[PDB]
Amino acid sequence: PRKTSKFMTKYERARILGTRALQISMNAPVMVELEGETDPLEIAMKELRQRKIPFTIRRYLPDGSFEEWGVDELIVEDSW
Amino acid sequence: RYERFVVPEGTKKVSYERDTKIINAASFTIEREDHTIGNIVRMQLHRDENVLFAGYQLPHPLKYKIIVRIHTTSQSSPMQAYNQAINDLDKELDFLKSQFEAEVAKFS
Amino acid sequence: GFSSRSVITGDAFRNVNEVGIPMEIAHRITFEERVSVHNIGYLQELVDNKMCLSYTQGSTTYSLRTVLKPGQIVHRRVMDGDVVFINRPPTTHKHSLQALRVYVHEDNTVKINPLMCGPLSADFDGDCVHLFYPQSLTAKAEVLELFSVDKQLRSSHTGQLILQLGLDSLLSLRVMMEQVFLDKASAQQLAMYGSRSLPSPAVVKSSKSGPAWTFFQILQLAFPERLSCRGDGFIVGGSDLLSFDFGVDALASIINGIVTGIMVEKGPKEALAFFDSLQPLLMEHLDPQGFSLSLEDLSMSREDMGVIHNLIVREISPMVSRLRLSYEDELQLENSIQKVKEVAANFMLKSYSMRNLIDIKSNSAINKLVQQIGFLGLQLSDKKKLYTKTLVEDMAQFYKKKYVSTSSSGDFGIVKGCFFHGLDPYEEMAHSVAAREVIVRSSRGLAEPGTLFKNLMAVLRDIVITNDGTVRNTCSNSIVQFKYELSSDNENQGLFEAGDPVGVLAATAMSNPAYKAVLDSSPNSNSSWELMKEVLLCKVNFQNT
Amino acid sequence: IIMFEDIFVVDKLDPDGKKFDKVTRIEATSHNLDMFMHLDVNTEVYPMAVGDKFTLAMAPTLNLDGTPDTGYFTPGAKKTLADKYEYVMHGKLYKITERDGQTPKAEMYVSFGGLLMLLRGDPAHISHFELDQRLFLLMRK
Amino acid sequence: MIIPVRCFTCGKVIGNKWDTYLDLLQADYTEGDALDAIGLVRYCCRRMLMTHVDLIEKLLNYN
Amino acid sequence: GFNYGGYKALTRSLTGSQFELLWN
Amino acid sequence: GATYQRFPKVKIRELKDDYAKFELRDTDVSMANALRRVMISEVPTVAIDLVEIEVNSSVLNDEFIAHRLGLIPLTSERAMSMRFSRDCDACDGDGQCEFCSVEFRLSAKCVTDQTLDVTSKDLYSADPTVTPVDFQRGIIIVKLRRGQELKLRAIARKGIGKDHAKWSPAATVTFMYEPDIIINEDMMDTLTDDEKIDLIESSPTKVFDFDAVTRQVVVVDPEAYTYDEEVIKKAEAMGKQGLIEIRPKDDSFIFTVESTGAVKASQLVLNAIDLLKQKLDAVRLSD
Amino acid sequence: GVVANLGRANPLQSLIDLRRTRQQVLYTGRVGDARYPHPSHWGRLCFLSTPDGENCGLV
Amino acid sequence: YTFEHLLDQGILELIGIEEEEDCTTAWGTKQLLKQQKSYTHCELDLSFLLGVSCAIVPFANHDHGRRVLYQSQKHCQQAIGFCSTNPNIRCDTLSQQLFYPQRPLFKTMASECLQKD
Amino acid sequence: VPDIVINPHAFPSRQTPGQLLEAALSKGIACPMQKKKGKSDAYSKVTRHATPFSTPSVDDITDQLHRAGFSRSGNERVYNGRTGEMMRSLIFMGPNFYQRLIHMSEDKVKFR
RNA sequence: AAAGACCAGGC
Ligand SMILES: [Mg+2]
Ligand SMILES: [Zn+2]
Ligand SMILES: [Zn+2]
């Protein structure tokens, strides 16, 4: 989808990880494997790192319009 | 409550660990010691000839624990150099004690 | 959920993002967890070891101060590895909300790394901080994701780093630079602290001594693997410090260039790992040497003091009885006394301890040493001071009265003595008026920044970068700006993104230098705050001032 | 087996000076084979004057028989290495840029742990040196 | 209140030396000579006796 | 200006709600 | 089959009870520092650890009295042979018990109208081996006026100076490097003798002196040197560089040992050597 | 600002609480040279010691 | 001496603020008085120009004025030292006291004249 | 050994040089006079006043330190406590009168 | 309860 940034912002990253960890705390099945981890936030971080997370976002423009998007389509890949 | 001074827990007094990146190299972790043992063991290992690295470190200055790292050549091994340093330190202390007892008996 | 107030102390040997918490605090604050799969055994271990304080299944809060089924709330006590967020009480501390990782100790204070003093603008002379403890899981995600130290590493007021090498670290680097070589024992002792391996010696064999490393090989022991970058005064290649040019006037900027090289190409935490390996190495380097200062450092010679007094009684005192009788536009006084102060600083930087304990290029910190070693300078004047002119005339008549031993041998507003040799009673009274005026200006005068920040936040609160990129108000939905930066677009990400509250960042970046200027209350920092008020506080109605 | 040797004579000390307190930089031409050189050297363990005689070698290994090199110089049974020299360094070649400006001169850049050295000269000698190769600075009077 | 048993810095026993120091002061000695004759060599030990304030006598009257 | 005379003038002249998550 | 051993040499210059001065050479500074650190913080003594107070009518409170009682030195020659109270199974603490505990008692009451001193000569042990150290009148504890009373019972145990400074046997143990002084006599002739007096008057202590019987200078007692740079900065201030030079003569030290009297000054050094052997033995590798 | 409490933290606090003098003013924060040393204080009031809060120079 | 005997012989005088404007006073120092006699009075000591917590500070004219203000107005009221000599009849809210209070090694003129510890 | 160690970055910035002059004076008056003259009145000419506005000059304080056997600059050589080596820098030492204030750490701990 | 009044620590 055009006209917006192909990067994910920090405010989307925070809410995606928050809702994913809240889902995992509610007995949801984990889309990846566990290398001996217990914290749900780190499981959600591994899910975001492996891009195995099902969600969709809607970026609202100021004029009323929006842009639908699927969460495995943004660049989250940036080291230093 | 002032009892956790020299007694360790169910751990070993000394624990050996042979690192993977460099060969002929190890790090001995000693519980309930500080600068006193670590400094003389370090300066006795430097007197050895098949020792290329010897160094000691407290992980935190408020902990009663040291870590001693030895890297040797291929003519010896870290455990031999450690034990040779300790035996040499005992024989030096015995020589010192005999000299001091002789001088004290001489002075009267 | 919970909050906590405590006195802070420092600790240089734990990590930058770590905070030490007293046990009396830690065993009475709880964290809440929802028990479910992947944590039945791990939480069962905790409740068996009596580390969970309380419980609620459903809603009826039964205490434990019971086996676990999936679906209730366990309240356990704070342990190692949790996340809190820290704030000194934000009187001026507008952006100091930091997220830190918890370890527990037995003392009564809160321990932080000394690199975190300038991000918090705190010191260890009695300051207290508030720690806050996030309970909800989405709040934990927001705190961990927006306010961590590696996330917040590059500043949003300036373009610089929030972490700078300060007092003891920079002094350790300077003394590591004035002698270049190190023997084997101390080099291997330092190499115990590095994250990398110690290299082969730069000098293998001289006929005089044994092998010897240089300090560049010691400084390279904190780099990550396969680093290769470049800046102004350095070349790093193959995770080796190939080149580092001479200086003490450049050294902090070269270290800042090395860290920005690492944080432009190295990782997710590698600049923090660089600091966490560098700082204890520098402490352990300086510790078997010591650093002190004696009376010899503070005693200017008889010759240089005679030159200072001769330059005063030649140049400064006949002029000051002329151009002070004119009005305010003649600040030639300040330039001429600054020339004499330059002469005094050139004299006093011959002592080896004094040039390492200050910043030489700084001028507010170099006037303070001239006041100690040489003359104090001008103390009384009747231009833009908070006292009147009748006080100045009374002090000039009193100067005629008390120095009955050859009155008018100088001026009444110039103090010729130093702090190290002691003031006269008249010079003490003249200095005490100037000190009292600075103290009153710093305490009573903190209401115009307080008003300015309120009126700045009242208008700049709701200005956001929008999803299409235009900087817009949100209560009126009007365009304030078409682009925030000049190279921001949807191919190149930048320092600022959509959703950023740029109005609050502008208001705080405007309020910080105002508070700093009034809290200093120097003449330069008074004139700057005047020049700032003459722009920020214009009036739409004509006042014909 | 070495890769270079030449007797050098210093032209001057300190082309700028004002640097670290126990380092001297020597700028030198060569006597026998046409070469240009300027180097950082320690002053207290090896004082060096103007108008000297010294020769320089560029071996990549100390051992006269064996090829590998791991470890410091703790002498003993295998002291049979090149001990013909009083001052040795160990560093890295980091820039082997080819000039073609006064093409008889071709420059080369090495660094011994922060101590720099530039060596110009003919293209017929700086070829077996290659980029990112460890080198030594065997040097005697 | 009373003289401390040991010097604060080094740990030398000084607690049996107060009345001797007062007796030497009463026979017209200087403070330096009264400390020289009593065996105190380090200045840390000398500042324990030069600076002690003997509050036990005032506490004994006011009950 | 950033005072009352400027503030009442404009007042007289005149993240949250940025995105939404849902299942897919 | 290798050996890399040292051979230290000891020469005692003055030895008495509670004092020892001796020079030690041909070892490293790490070994001298180990002996110093162990003598300060590792050699055990016996000191009062529990105080149980029955009557206190004095104008001092109980923590003041207990802290004063904790710091009185007792005679401790048994301390290497008895055991810590964390290790003794033959008792419960709480009384007299050999290998771990000594009981003391004290009782005093003023009946005259003069002020009664209560010293450390009023503490009576139930063991005639562990008594307070004899130095005078004894160490003052409290003073009473009339009708006041002190009555208590104490338990003295074994410990080390790393735990509390009341168990340390050393009022001060220190060493110093032995100096090596050279004076270049070919540059000493260049100075007139008032300039020589001006040079010698820069030294704080009495290391150099002037013998006008040959009109020269001489280094006499080169161990009063304190390694400040005063004479060297004076000769560098006159321009006459390199006239004198001082280097610390390596592997040679001078130890000074003072004890509180709980143990003798030779026994402190010998127990330091024994404890340092005992912790070198417990660190070994089994293999 | 007439009657104060006597402090007994040490005897010096009680000593200096009994030797104070005050210029009471209407709105604290707009005074003239009341907060400053005048040369007629010489020998009779201390020109070095004073509070630093609102009562700076007035006490 | 007594103070009354020195007043009754005219060696000392009590002087107010307005009369002191007609006075040439030597600065305390007898070396200012006796090197030149164009004076009518002389001070007893210059350090008596300061208050009781400021005159006892060593080298107090060698420090910056904000620091002397910090010491003599704030920090000396908060120090823990002597409290009282009859604590059995003092029911204060808080009372603190050192175990062994000491006096300084130096001797100012005010501390030699008041004779208080 | 010291009782209190303070940082040398506190002195060039706070403008309190008198703290160095008090410590150099106090050290001169608690030390024994070594009697290089060997006369009776070795402790007669001892300077101990430091009265404000009539302080002693620094030549008197340094001459008092020199008669006691110390360097005039006020610093002295010290050995490192953890390793035993002679430290390269000389250290300023001396007695200062310190005060323990009523603000204590265990009274500032609060939790809501 | 609520306000006055005081003091202290910061800004
Ligand atoms: Mg502060
Ligand atoms: Zn002592
Ligand atoms: Zn028992």
Q: What is the Cα–Cα distance from C530 to C536, expressed in whole angstroms?
A: 10
Do G102 and G178 belong to one domain? Answer: no
- Six-digit token pair at C158? 């300036």
8 Å CB contact between J108 and C7: yes
Picking from G112, G136, G165, the residue at the C-terminal end of a domain is G165
Report the relative pairing of strands C18-22 and C98-105 from DSSP bridges.
Answer: parallel
Picking from G115, G142, G165, the residue at the C-terminal end of a domain is G165
State the Cα angle at J26 between J25 and J32, rounded to 5°: 105
Q: What is the Cα–Cα distance from E35 to E44, expressed in whole angstroms?
A: 12
Judged by a CB distance cut-off of 8 A, whether residue I96 touches chain C is no
Q: Is the dihedral of CA E42, E45, E47, E49 positive or negative?
A: negative
Contact yes or no for A55 and F21 at CB 8 A:
yes
Do G105 and G153 belong to one domain? Answer: yes
Exposure on the CB side of residue G219, measured as CA atoms within 13 A: 16
Q: What is the Cα–Cα distance from C258 to I113, expressed in whole angstroms?
A: 63
Listed in sequence order, the residues at least 6 apart from C112 whose beta carbon sits closer than 8 Å to its beta carbon are C8, C10, C11, C19, C20, C86, C100, C120
8 Å CB contact between G75 and G130: yes
DSSP string, H42-59: TTTS-SS---SSTTTTT-
8 Å CB contact between F2 and C536: yes
Q: Which chains touch J (3 or more CB pairs under 8 A)?
A: B, C, E, G, I
Do G222 and G259 belong to one domain? Answer: yes
Domain count for chain G, please give it.
Answer: 2
Q: What is the Cα–Cα distance from G125 to G151, expressed in whole angstroms?
A: 14
Listed in sequence order, the residues at least 6 apart from J98 whose beta carbon sits closer than 8 Å to its beta carbon are J4
3-state SS, residue C442: helix
Question: Distance in angstroms, CA of H11 to C1' of K6?
Answer: 21
- Six-digit token pair at G174? 């220190």
DSSP type of residue G75: P
Nearest to C99 by CA among C161, C148, C142, C132: C148
Q: What is the Cα–Cα distance from J17 to C370, expressed in whole angstroms?
A: 13
Tokens 């604290």 sit on residue: H28
Which residues face J75 on adjacent strands?
J92
Q: What is the Cα–Cα distance from G34 to B43, expressed in whole angstroms?
A: 12
Judged by a CB distance cut-off of 8 A, whether residue H24 touches chain I is no
Nearest to G23 by CA among G172, G178, G171: G178
Do G49 and G38 belong to one domain? Answer: no
8 Å CB contact between G139 and G123: no
Q: What is the Cα–Cα distance from C404 to C327, expressed in whole angstroms?
A: 30
Q: How far is residue C121 CA from its own chain's centroid? A: 6
Q: What is the Cα–Cα distance from B84 to B91, expressed in whole angstroms?
A: 11
CA-to-CA separations, B94 to D44, G77, G264, in angstroms, rounded: 41, 22, 21
8 Å CB contact between J7 and J19: no
8 Å CB contact between C373 and C298: yes
Nearest to G165 by CA among E49, E39, E7: E7
- Six-digit token pair at C135? 């309970």
State the Cα angle at G220 between G214 and G225, rounded to 5°: 135
Q: What HEC string does chain B produce?
A: CCCCCCCCCCCCCEECCECCCCCCEEEEEEECCCHHHHHHHHHHHCCCCCEEEEEEECCCCCCCEEEEEEEECCCCCHHHHHHHHHHHHHHHHHHHHHHHHHHHHHHC
Mark residue B3 as left, alpha or beta (left: phi above 0; alpha: psi -120 to 50; beta: remaining): alpha
3-state SS, residue D103: coil
Q: What is the Cα–Cα distance from C272 to C153, expressed in whole angstroms?
A: 9
Q: What is the Cα–Cα distance from C169 to C114, expressed in whole angstroms?
A: 10
Closest Cβ opposite residue F7 in set C452, C455, C467: C455
CATH number at residue B47: 3.30.1360.10
- Six-digit token pair at G162? 């790393």
How far does residue C121's CA lie from ligand 1's centre (Å)?
A: 9
Assess if residue B19 is contained within a domain.
yes
How far does residue J76's CA lie from ligand 2's centre (Å)?
A: 18
How many residue contacts between B and C have a Cβ separation below 8 Å? 24
Q: What is the Cα–Cα distance from H33 to H12, expressed in whole angstroms?
A: 29
Do G195 and G285 belong to one domain? Answer: yes
Listed in sequence order, the residues at least 6 apart from I46 whose beta carbon sits closer than 8 Å to its beta carbon are C425, I27, I28, I29, J52, J53, J54
CA-to-CA separations, J88 to G232, G253, I33, in angstroms, rounded: 15, 18, 50
Assess if residue B65 is contained within a domain.
yes
Q: What is the Cα–Cα distance from I36 to I27, expressed in whole angstroms?
A: 12
Report the relative pairing of strands C234-236 and C229-230 from DSSP bridges.
Answer: antiparallel
Q: How far is residue G131 CA from its own chain's centroid? A: 20
Domain count for chain E, please give it.
Answer: 1
Assess if residue B2 is contained within a domain.
no
8 Å CB contact between G58 and G181: no
Q: What is the Cα–Cα distance from C100 to C80, expressed in whole angstroms?
A: 11
Do G184 and G285 belong to one domain? Answer: yes
DSSP string, C164-183: ---HHHHHHHHHHHHS-EE-
Do G140 and G172 belong to one domain? Answer: no
Judged by a CB distance cut-off of 8 A, whether residue I114 touches chain J is no
Do G150 and G36 belong to one domain? Answer: no
8 Å CB contact between D96 and D108: yes
Q: What is the Cα–Cα distance from C355 to G237, expressed in whole angstroms?
A: 21
Burial annotation G183-197 (CB, 10 A radius, 16+ → b, else e): eeeeeeeebeeeebe
Picking from G165, G195, G220, the residue at the C-terminal end of a domain is G165
Tokens 């701990």 sit on residue: J109
Question: Distance in angstroms, CA of I57 to C1' of K5?
Answer: 34
Q: What is the Cα–Cα distance from B57 to B66, expressed in whole angstroms?
A: 6
Tokens 């008003």 sit on residue: C451
DSSP string, C343-378: HHHHHHTTSTTTTTSS-TT-SHHHHHHHHHHS--EE
8 Å CB contact between D66 and D11: no
Judged by a CB distance cut-off of 8 A, whether residue B61 touches chain G is no
Mark residue D62 as left, alpha or beta (left: phi above 0; alpha: psi -120 to 50; beta: remaining): alpha
Listed in sequence order, the residues at least 6 apart from B49 whose beta carbon sits closer than 8 Å to its beta carbon are D74, D76, G2, G4
Question: Distance in angstroms, CA of E8 to C1' of K7?
Answer: 36
Nearest to J30 by CA among I104, G196, C522: I104
Question: Distance in angstroms, CA of H28 to C1' of K5?
Answer: 16
How far is the alpha carbon of C301 from chain I, nearest alpha carbon, in Å?
18
Report the relative pairing of strands C479-481 and D55-57 from DSSP bridges.
Answer: unpaired
Domain with E40, as residue range(s), is: 1-63
Chains C and A touch (3+ CB pairs under 8 A): yes
For G228, other C-beta atoms within 10 Å of its C-beta total 19
Listed in sequence order, the residues at least 6 apart from C362 whose beta carbon sits closer than 8 Å to its beta carbon are none
Tokens 């917040």 sit on residue: C152
For residue C154, count CB atoms less than 10 angstroms from its CB and return exposed for 0-12, middle for 13-18, buried for 19 or more: middle
CA torsion I48-I50-I56-I59 (nearest 10°) is: -100
Nearest residue, CA→C1' of K5: H1
Which residues face G217 on adjacent strands?
G210
Do G260 and G145 belong to one domain? Answer: no
For residue C526, count CB atoms less than 10 angstroms from its CB and return exposed for 0-12, middle for 13-18, buried for 19 or more: middle
Do G235 and G138 belong to one domain? Answer: no
8 Å CB contact between B27 and B15: no
Q: What is the Cα–Cα distance from C146 to C139, expressed in whole angstroms?
A: 11
Which residues face G50 on adjacent strands?
G155
The CB-based long-range contact list for A68-76 (8 Å cut-off, 24+ gap) reads A68/A1, A69/A1, A70/F24, A71/A16, A74/A6, A74/A7, A74/A8, A74/A12, A75/A6, A75/A7, A75/A8, A76/A7, A76/A8, A76/A13, A76/A48, A76/A51
Domain with G66, as residue range(s), is: 45-165
CA-to-CA separations, C129 to C4, C20, C85, C118, C279, in angstroms, rounded: 8, 13, 10, 14, 24
DSSP type of residue C152: T
How far does residue C216's CA lie from ligand 2's centre (Å)?
A: 44
How far does residue G99's CA lie from ligand 3's centre (Å)?
A: 6
Q: What is the Cα–Cα distance from C484 to C496, expressed in whole angstroms?
A: 8
Do G39 and G170 belong to one domain? Answer: yes
Domain with B31, as residue range(s), is: 14-107
Nearest to C249 by CA among C360, C381, C349, C116: C360
3-state SS, residue D13: strand
Q: What is the Cα–Cα distance from D106 to D96, expressed in whole angstroms?
A: 9
Q: Is the dihedral of CA C274, C275, C276, C279 positive or negative?
A: positive
Q: Which chains touch A (3 or more CB pairs under 8 A)?
A: C, F
Which method was it determined by?
Answer: cryo-EM
Assess if residue B44 is contained within a domain.
yes
Assess if residue B71 is contained within a domain.
yes
Do G138 and G112 belong to one domain? Answer: yes
Tokens 């002389």 sit on residue: I42
Lookup: nucleotide whose C1' is closest to H55 CA? K7
Domain count for chain B, please give it.
Answer: 1
Amino acid at C169: S
Helix, strand, coil percent content, chain H, rounded in steps of 5? 15, 0, 85
For G35, other C-beta atoms within 10 Å of its C-beta total 26
DSSP string, C201-224: -SEEE-SSS--BEEHHHHHGGG--
For C31, other C-beta atoms within 10 Å of its C-beta total 20
Lookup: nucleotide whose C1' is closest to C127 CA? K10
Q: Which helix (H) or strand (E) holds J27?
A: helix J18-29
